Design an enzyme around this catalytic site. Sequence first.
Site, PDB file in Angstrom:
ATOM      1  N   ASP A   1       3.790  -7.001 -12.051  1.00 58.85           N
ATOM      2  CA  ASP A   1       5.127  -7.083 -11.454  1.00 58.85           C
ATOM      3  C   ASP A   1       5.199  -8.366 -10.658  1.00 58.85           C
ATOM      4  O   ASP A   1       4.329  -8.645  -9.854  1.00 58.85           O
ATOM      5  CB  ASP A   1       5.356  -5.850 -10.569  1.00 58.85           C
ATOM      6  CG  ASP A   1       6.577  -5.936  -9.742  1.00 58.85           C
ATOM      7  OD1 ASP A   1       7.696  -5.956 -10.298  1.00 58.85           O
ATOM      8  OD2 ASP A   1       6.450  -5.983  -8.485  1.00 58.85           O
TER       9      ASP A   1
ATOM     10  N   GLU B   1      10.350 -14.149  -4.347  1.00 58.97           N
ATOM     11  CA  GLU B   1      11.386 -14.112  -3.316  1.00 58.97           C
ATOM     12  C   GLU B   1      11.546 -15.519  -2.747  1.00 58.97           C
ATOM     13  O   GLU B   1      10.929 -15.828  -1.725  1.00 58.97           O
ATOM     14  CB  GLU B   1      10.979 -13.119  -2.239  1.00 58.97           C
ATOM     15  CG  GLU B   1      10.801 -11.737  -2.834  1.00 58.97           C
ATOM     16  CD  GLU B   1      10.559 -10.651  -1.806  1.00 58.97           C
ATOM     17  OE1 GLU B   1      10.918 -10.823  -0.613  1.00 58.97           O
ATOM     18  OE2 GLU B   1      10.018  -9.606  -2.204  1.00 58.97           O
TER      19      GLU B   1
ATOM     20  N   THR C   1      17.641  -3.357  -3.414  1.00 56.88           N
ATOM     21  CA  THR C   1      18.894  -2.936  -2.803  1.00 56.88           C
ATOM     22  C   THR C   1      18.668  -2.387  -1.372  1.00 56.88           C
ATOM     23  O   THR C   1      18.971  -1.232  -1.070  1.00 56.88           O
ATOM     24  CB  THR C   1      19.624  -1.971  -3.732  1.00 56.88           C
ATOM     25  OG1 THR C   1      18.700  -1.169  -4.477  1.00 56.88           O
ATOM     26  CG2 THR C   1      20.469  -2.693  -4.744  1.00 56.88           C
ATOM     27  N   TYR C   2      18.163  -3.265  -0.519  1.00 59.94           N
ATOM     28  CA  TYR C   2      17.890  -2.952   0.862  1.00 59.94           C
ATOM     29  C   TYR C   2      17.706  -4.289   1.573  1.00 59.94           C
ATOM     30  O   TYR C   2      17.829  -5.351   0.966  1.00 59.94           O
ATOM     31  CB  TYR C   2      16.690  -2.005   1.012  1.00 59.94           C
ATOM     32  CG  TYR C   2      15.462  -2.326   0.190  1.00 59.94           C
ATOM     33  CD1 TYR C   2      14.712  -3.457   0.420  1.00 59.94           C
ATOM     34  CD2 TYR C   2      15.007  -1.464  -0.805  1.00 59.94           C
ATOM     35  CE1 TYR C   2      13.578  -3.728  -0.328  1.00 59.94           C
ATOM     36  CE2 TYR C   2      13.867  -1.727  -1.541  1.00 59.94           C
ATOM     37  CZ  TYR C   2      13.147  -2.848  -1.296  1.00 59.94           C
ATOM     38  OH  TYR C   2      12.028  -3.081  -2.028  1.00 59.94           O
ATOM     39  N   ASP C   3      17.400  -4.243   2.868  1.00 64.83           N
ATOM     40  CA  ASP C   3      17.308  -5.471   3.673  1.00 64.83           C
ATOM     41  C   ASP C   3      18.606  -6.234   3.657  1.00 64.83           C
ATOM     42  O   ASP C   3      18.597  -7.465   3.766  1.00 64.83           O
ATOM     43  CB  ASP C   3      16.129  -6.350   3.277  1.00 64.83           C
ATOM     44  CG  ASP C   3      14.804  -5.670   3.488  1.00 64.83           C
ATOM     45  OD1 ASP C   3      14.709  -4.639   4.217  1.00 64.83           O
ATOM     46  OD2 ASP C   3      13.809  -6.159   2.911  1.00 64.83           O
TER      47      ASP C   3
ATOM     48  N   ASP D   1     -23.362   2.339  -7.769  1.00 66.74           N
ATOM     49  CA  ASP D   1     -23.348   2.031  -9.203  1.00 66.74           C
ATOM     50  C   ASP D   1     -22.009   2.024  -9.860  1.00 66.74           C
ATOM     51  O   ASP D   1     -21.757   2.834 -10.780  1.00 66.74           O
ATOM     52  CB  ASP D   1     -24.140   3.161  -9.852  1.00 66.74           C
ATOM     53  CG  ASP D   1     -24.727   2.806 -11.191  1.00 66.74           C
ATOM     54  OD1 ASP D   1     -24.675   1.625 -11.595  1.00 66.74           O
ATOM     55  OD2 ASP D   1     -25.284   3.669 -11.913  1.00 66.74           O
TER      56      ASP D   1
ATOM     57  N   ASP E   1       7.131 -10.434  -7.829  1.00 65.30           N
ATOM     58  CA  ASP E   1       8.076 -10.314  -6.724  1.00 65.30           C
ATOM     59  C   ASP E   1       8.351 -11.700  -6.142  1.00 65.30           C
ATOM     60  O   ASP E   1       7.928 -12.037  -5.043  1.00 65.30           O
ATOM     61  CB  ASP E   1       7.542  -9.359  -5.674  1.00 65.30           C
ATOM     62  CG  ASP E   1       7.350  -7.970  -6.189  1.00 65.30           C
ATOM     63  OD1 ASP E   1       7.810  -7.702  -7.338  1.00 65.30           O
ATOM     64  OD2 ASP E   1       6.743  -7.113  -5.542  1.00 65.30           O
TER      65      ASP E   1
ATOM     66  N   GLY F   1       3.012 -11.601  -5.216  1.00 68.13           N
ATOM     67  CA  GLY F   1       3.966 -12.319  -4.395  1.00 68.13           C
ATOM     68  C   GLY F   1       4.489 -11.557  -3.197  1.00 68.13           C
ATOM     69  O   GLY F   1       3.744 -11.239  -2.273  1.00 68.13           O
ATOM     70  N   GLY F   2       5.793 -11.293  -3.199  1.00 65.96           N
ATOM     71  CA  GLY F   2       6.468 -10.699  -2.073  1.00 65.96           C
ATOM     72  C   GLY F   2       6.993 -11.738  -1.105  1.00 65.96           C
ATOM     73  O   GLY F   2       6.974 -12.947  -1.384  1.00 65.96           O
TER      74      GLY F   2
END
Length: 419
Positions: free
Chosen positions: A168, A172, A246-248, A103, A170, A130-131
């Site tokens: 949000d 890319e 701030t990575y990859d 329920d 994302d 996204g992403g």
Amino acid sequence: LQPATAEAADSYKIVGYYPSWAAYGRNYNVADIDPTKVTHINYAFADICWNGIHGNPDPSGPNPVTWTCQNEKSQTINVPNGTIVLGDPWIDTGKTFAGDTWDQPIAGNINQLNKLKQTNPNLKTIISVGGWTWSNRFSDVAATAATREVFANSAVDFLRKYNFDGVDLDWEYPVSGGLDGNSKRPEDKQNYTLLLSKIREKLDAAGAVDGKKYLLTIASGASATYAANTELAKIAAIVDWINIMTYDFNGAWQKISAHNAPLNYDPAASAAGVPDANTFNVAAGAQGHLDAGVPAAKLVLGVPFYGRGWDGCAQAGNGQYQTCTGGSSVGTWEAGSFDFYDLEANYINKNGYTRYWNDTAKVPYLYNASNKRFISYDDAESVGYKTAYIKSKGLGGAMFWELSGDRNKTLQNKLKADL
């Protein structure tokens, strides 16, 4: 408890990503999250419907599959092009978990996110659209008024139906980069800003109706190209904040080993011919946003709870900045990448991997001299330099990818302690 003294810090954001697919073989469920460690959870991801289906068949991505657009019961729906849809209905809203009964309107990971709030009422949830894999239709959505309108109204619909606190984006990436099969246009630069403005318009109206504030954020690229291809100052005026990725900066896709998230510029990286070493570091990326006019409080610094490795690196420099044979053939869940908890259990000063420290870039790395593997990663110490940077620059807080990679809460505890 006595009411606690207010301090400027009381206000740092800690935005943790939860990937929907963690609930499959990774065996890391929403109910495993400790909400006390974060201020916001971004749920990754919702997708965009186009011609009644969604996804991305580009074979250069890790999940080259499409599905029909569906409702929360995994039934196919007919919605206009540009509509935000559940990315994985079964796991998102269909699977039942402890506390669910027949329920209730929705189950799945999303209902579990709402349960975390019930138990931890300060938490906010945000749906990420996204992403890397599902950025293939953003350009098409942003390209005309009609699809910007559909997308914006559908964001309100999604937030209202599933009790998200915000949305949000994302993307890319606008204009260039991302998977080759993504739709792209030069005008993505201006169109993205207008897409965001239209979403804000609809969120403002919905919040006025519903009696709350809805949030709007984006995840941004950290390169100079991303900044040139977007209107960061205009975006900043519209959104609640920007989570900078701030990575990859380096990884198993290149032959020269280097760092996933070096904080500062290391001249040795340039001498080694590491591609874009001058700018591919955390401080350069964040500074590019500040230089563009993003207010510091609207900049949330991305931090990786995983590392990246290479196979066949020479002993010189302890494997660092060496021309290796390729990306690592080993990884926690996919070749080339290592979740921090896996590093803690099986690699850091274990099983032939020795830790080294780059005191210029302020990051650790592992090298196994017997098997020649090099791994760049982030640990509590390097996260401490990243929080020190956040505090020194007055940034809005930290974002991290992702909750399942930090199973012992080691890195979450460090963010908590520092922010």
